[PDB]
Amino acid sequence: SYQDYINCSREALLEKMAELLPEKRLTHCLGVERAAMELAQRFGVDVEKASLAGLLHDYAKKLSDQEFLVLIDRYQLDPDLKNWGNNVWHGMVGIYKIQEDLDLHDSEILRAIEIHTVGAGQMTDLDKVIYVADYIEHNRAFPGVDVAREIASLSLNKAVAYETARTVEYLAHQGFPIYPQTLETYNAFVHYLK
Amino acid sequence: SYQDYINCSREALLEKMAELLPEKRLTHCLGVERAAMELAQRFGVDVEKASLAGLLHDYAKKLSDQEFLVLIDRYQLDPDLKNWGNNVWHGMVGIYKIQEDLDLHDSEILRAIEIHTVGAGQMTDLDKVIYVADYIEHNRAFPGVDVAREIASLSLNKAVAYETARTVEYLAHQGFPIYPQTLETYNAFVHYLK
Numbered sequence A, B: 001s002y003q004d005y006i007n008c009s010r011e012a013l014l015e016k017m018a019e020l021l022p023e024k025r026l027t028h029c030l031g032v033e034r035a036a037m038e039l040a041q042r043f044g045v046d047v048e049k050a051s052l053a054g055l056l057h058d059y060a061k062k063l064s065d066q067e068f069l070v071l072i073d074r075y076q077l078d079p080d081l082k083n084w085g086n087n088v089w090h091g092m093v094g095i096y097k098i099q100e101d102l103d104l105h106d107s108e109i110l111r112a113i114e115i116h117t118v119g120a121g122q123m124t125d126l127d128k129v130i131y132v133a134d135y136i137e138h139n140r141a142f143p144g145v146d147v148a149r150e151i152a153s154l155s156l157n158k159a160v161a162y163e164t165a166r167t168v169e170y171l172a173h174q175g176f177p178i179y180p181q182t183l184e185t186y187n188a189f190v191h192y193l194k
C-alpha cells in the first residue's frame, strides 16, 4: 500500500492533492500513475514504487517561487538553482516539500521525482519509467505523442532518448534557457535513437 | 597586411589553402573573410583581424581524426576532446595546426578561430564577428539564412543568440550529440532573442 511509503492512504493523498493542484494537473498525475504502472510491468520495475512516484511527480507544481527559494536555502541546495524557475524547481526542489508533507523518505522514489523533468546522465529504471510516463500518459495530446508511445512500448532507453531530444529541440525552438542537467541526459541517451 | 600576423602573404596563404581544402570549402572561407570585414566595420572590430580570422577559420577542416588526436596529446588539451570529432576539433584543436603552419600567435585571432563552431559563455566582439560571419557568408543558402542576415545587420549579440538557438535546435532535431560548450553559449545569449 502507499502507506508503506507515505503518512496517509492513497485516497487521503488524492484528497490532499485535489486541494493543492488544479483539476487538469491532478488528472495528469493520475494518468502518470497509470502509465508508470504499465511501463514498470514492461521493464521490470516495482509497480508500486512506480505508481506512487508517478502520482506524486507533480505534487509541488504549484508552489510559489518564494517557497522554492526558501527550500533551496533551508536544505542548502545548489545555489545556482536560484537562477532558474518552476520548471527546474518543482521536481529538483519540490521533493523536499513532498518529504515534509508526506513523510516520504524512500530514496528511489525521491530520486525519480527529483529528476522527472531534467533526467540525469545516469538514471535508474525507475527514474526512466517516471520520466517517460510523464510524457506519454493518456491525457497528453501534443503532436508526436503517438511516436513516443510507440517507442515506449519497445524500449525504455529509446523512449528517454526520444523525449529528451524533442525537449531540447523544443526549448531551443522557443528560445528558452536549457538547464544543463538536461544536456547531460541528452548526450548520455541520444545514441539509443540509432 | 596579413604578414603582420602570419608567415606569408595573403596570396601565398590562398595558394596553400587551395591545396588543403576542397574548392567549395575555400570559397566558403573567402565568403567568411568578406562577411567578417563587413560585420567588423558595423560593430567596431579591427577589420584586418576579422578578415584574417574569417579566412582562416576552417583552415583545419580536412585534417584527419588521427592528426587531431595527435594534436590533443601533443598540446595536452582537455582529454574529453577525444570523445568528439571534426565538428568540435577543427576549430578547438585546429588552431594548433594553424599556429604551426603559419606562425600565428595573435591571441585574439586564435581565440576567434578556436570557438568559431561552439562559441563560449563569454565572447569578445571579434569572436562574435567570426561566429556570425561563418553562418551568414554569401555562399550559405540554408532555410532561414535570410533571417540571420537581417538580425546580423542590427545586432551582433542577437545574431549570436539566433545562430546558437538554431544550431541547438537542429542538432537535437537530427539526434546528434551537443558539445557542452555550445549550451554555455546558448544559455548566455538566448536572452537577446527578446
Ligand SMILES: Nc1ncnc2c1ncn2[C@@H]1O[C@H](COP(=O)(O)OP(=O)(O)O)[C@@H](O)[C@H]1O
Pocket: A028, A058, A061, A087, A088, A116, A117, A118, A134, A167, A171, A176, A177, A178, A179, A180, A182, A183
Ligand atoms: N532543461 C530544461 N530547462 C528549462 N525547462 C525545461 C527543461 N526541461 C524541461 N523543461 C520544461 O519544463 C516544463 C515541465 O516539464 P515536465 O516536468 O517534464 O512536465 P510537466 O509539465 O508535466 O510538469 C515543460 O514546459 C518543459 O518544456
Ligand SMILES: Nc1ncnc2c1ncn2[C@@H]1O[C@H](COP(=O)(O)OP(=O)(O)O)[C@@H](O)[C@H]1O
Pocket: B028, B058, B061, B087, B088, B116, B117, B118, B134, B167, B171, B176, B177, B178, B179, B180, B182, B183
Ligand atoms: N555543439 C556541437 N556539437 C556537435 N556539432 C556541432 C556543435 N555545434 C555545431 N556543430 C556542427 O559542426 C558543424 C560545423 O559547424 P561550423 O564550424 O560552425 O561551420 P562549418 O561547416 O563552416 O565549419 C555543423 O554541422 C554544425 O552543426
Ligand SMILES: [Fe+3]
Pocket: A057, A058, A090, A091, A116, A117
Ligand atoms: Fe513535472
Ligand SMILES: [Fe+3]
Pocket: A028, A032, A057, A058, A134
Ligand atoms: Fe508531469
Ligand SMILES: [Fe+3]
Pocket: B057, B058, B090, B091, B116, B117
Ligand atoms: Fe567551421
Ligand SMILES: [Fe+3]
Pocket: B028, B032, B057, B058, B134
Ligand atoms: Fe565555416
